[PDB]
Design an enzyme around this catalytic site. Structure first.
Site, short mmCIF file in Angstrom:
data_model
loop_
_atom_site.label_atom_id
_atom_site.label_comp_id
_atom_site.label_asym_id
_atom_site.label_seq_id
_atom_site.Cartn_x
_atom_site.Cartn_y
_atom_site.Cartn_z
N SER A 93 0.86 -1.19 0.00
CA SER A 93 0.00 0.00 0.00
C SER A 93 0.89 1.23 0.00
O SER A 93 1.70 1.39 -0.93
CB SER A 93 -1.00 -0.10 1.16
OG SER A 93 -1.83 1.04 1.21
N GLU A 185 -0.87 -3.51 -7.97
CA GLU A 185 -2.12 -3.79 -7.27
C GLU A 185 -2.69 -2.48 -6.75
O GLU A 185 -1.98 -1.48 -6.59
CB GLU A 185 -1.92 -4.77 -6.11
CG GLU A 185 -1.58 -4.12 -4.78
CD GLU A 185 -0.12 -3.75 -4.66
OE1 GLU A 185 0.68 -4.21 -5.50
OE2 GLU A 185 0.23 -3.00 -3.73
N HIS A 255 -4.82 -5.82 -2.09
CA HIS A 255 -5.49 -5.50 -0.84
C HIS A 255 -6.57 -6.53 -0.53
O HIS A 255 -7.72 -6.18 -0.29
CB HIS A 255 -6.10 -4.09 -0.90
CG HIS A 255 -5.09 -2.99 -0.97
ND1 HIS A 255 -4.23 -2.84 -2.04
CD2 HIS A 255 -4.81 -1.99 -0.11
CE1 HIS A 255 -3.45 -1.79 -1.82
NE2 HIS A 255 -3.78 -1.26 -0.66
#
Lengths: 285, 291
Positions: A93, A185, A255
């Site tokens: 992230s 991602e 995630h």
């Protein structure tokens, strides 16, 4: 195992709960963990990572939360000493920005789990946790999945969050990878916002130099009748026509509850045969 | 004068467009509608949307070129010929996703206007006299002055090339050859649906890429429709602005009345701006742009 906080405010009891999960699986836990959304100020959140990279009893450095605040911690940090620290930095992230500056200085990182979700939740995933300790204690990994082109390339594995990668564009903290395998991602985005961020890295000339592009877990979108057929398949068909490199989908990383630990900086081996994909990564600490 | 309507991004219902054309008619302008072909989320395919821009820039009866929507231009940066567009002499206006179109024009030395579009400035029933009068004035007057009230701003007195637009589209330009190389200019930004940490993030990309270090001043437009929570723990636009001014080496001026709001001004991207702040009293004179 060291638990640093690059810029995330986490509930106080959930971290103590995640400590027991780390200890019940055999791991020496050392926590270095307030200011607004962040766990501390910029200088303190910078110092906690520096002190964690100097503790001899520390091998793995896992990030606390991946919201926002690790880009603030780039000038106050010395990634040259971080490369020589021999530590194993894992996270995803927002923490992807920290792993690019490490790869910028020739340090191999790991794109895997964090404490915020993969360790505080009561719905623990054996897939995620077992793949984590495997990547930490095995000289090689293998990522095989089921996919719905014929590729067989080998190069430096690198990538992470797509929003952070688009944020690194034009900055000196972006690794100049020559002929590598790029994975991405994200979550809560839109196929047009995903295509927009991927075109930024293509216009910047990064995608042309790579040898393959891998699509990970792009999770939780929101479409409407205004899209009129535009979706993930509409983008993928248009992206495979614009890009000169192959585009392979199905990477089990994002995630999501189930994710694998991806060494950012190792020598990968991407293979697409007949729907059976296989990613073998080697040479990583 | 004559105007051309182009759809570089999304589509608009034909009912709203016909009402928007009537407004341009009532204000005394000759409308040339090039909008038609409709392809998925966009009003046409990339090649058709590109051809409609090259065709309107070649019509001798057209002087202003307005964009339809700005909700995703990038898909056809290579299909267009911005060297041909810079020589076309047209006055391109727009905002939101159309900032991408205006940066490539400025990369080739073409002055564009960051202003209204057909989307929500001429189709709405609650028409804004502030927006429409400021738009017609910039098209017909060689100079435009913008004055607003904003507190806690530093006292600056700089003068440089005005440029910028949407913050998301500008951070999207980071690292791409389409980013203009303005040295010592006055940069302005705006955005919507963005939490202040998303604003600081994209501003850090423009700072790490070295764009903010060269400019003379940073001007903040409208950043509306937020969603703060208790987890921010006091973090908001003021806490971000204070951290931004401590990090940045250039002065940051706020209060610019431009963005995705009902009342907006038309800013000539590429013009010669004169920024003046006098402890709450801020004034921005703009010149050296085609009329």
């Amino acid at each position: 195992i060291a638990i640093i906080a690059p810029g995330g405010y986490v509930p106080d009891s959930d971290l103590q709960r995640a400590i027991g999960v780390l200890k019940s699986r055999g791991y020496e836990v050392f926590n270095y963990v307030r200011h607004e959304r962040f766990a501390a100020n910029d200088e303190e959140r910078s110092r906690q990572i520096m002190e964690a990279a100097t503790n001899p009893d520390v091998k793995i450095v896992i990030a606390l939360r991946g919201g926002y605040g690790t880009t603030r911690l780039l000038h106050d940090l010395d990634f040259a000493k971080l490369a020589k620290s021999g530590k194993l930095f894992v996270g995803h992230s927002d923490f992807t920005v920290f792993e690019m500056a490490l790869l910028k200085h020739g340090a191999v990182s790991f794109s895997g789990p964090m404490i915020q979700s993969d360790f505080t939740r009561g719905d623990l995933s054996a897939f995620t946790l077992n793949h984590f300790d495997e990547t930490m204690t095995s000289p090689e990994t293998s990522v095989k999945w089921v996919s719905k082109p014929d590729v067989d390339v080998e190069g430096t594995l690198w990538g992470g969050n797509l929003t952070m990668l688009a944020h690194m564009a034009g900055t000196p903290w972006m690794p100049d990878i020559s002929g590598g395998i790029l994975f991405v991602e994200d979550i809560h985005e839109h196929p047009y916002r995903v295509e927009r961020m991927l075109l930024q890295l293509d216009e910047s000339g990064i995608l042309k130099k790579q040898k393959a592009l891998v699509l990970g877990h792009f999770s939780e979108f929101k479409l409407s009748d205004y899209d009129n057929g535009y979706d993930f398949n509409a983008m993928l068909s248009w992206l495979r026509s614009r890009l000169s490199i192959p585009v392979v989908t199905g990477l089990p990383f994002g995630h999501t509850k189930d994710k694998v630990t991806l060494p950012v900086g190792g020598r990968a081996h991407l293979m697409s045969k007949a729907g059976k994909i296989q990613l073998d990564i080697g040479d990583y600490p």
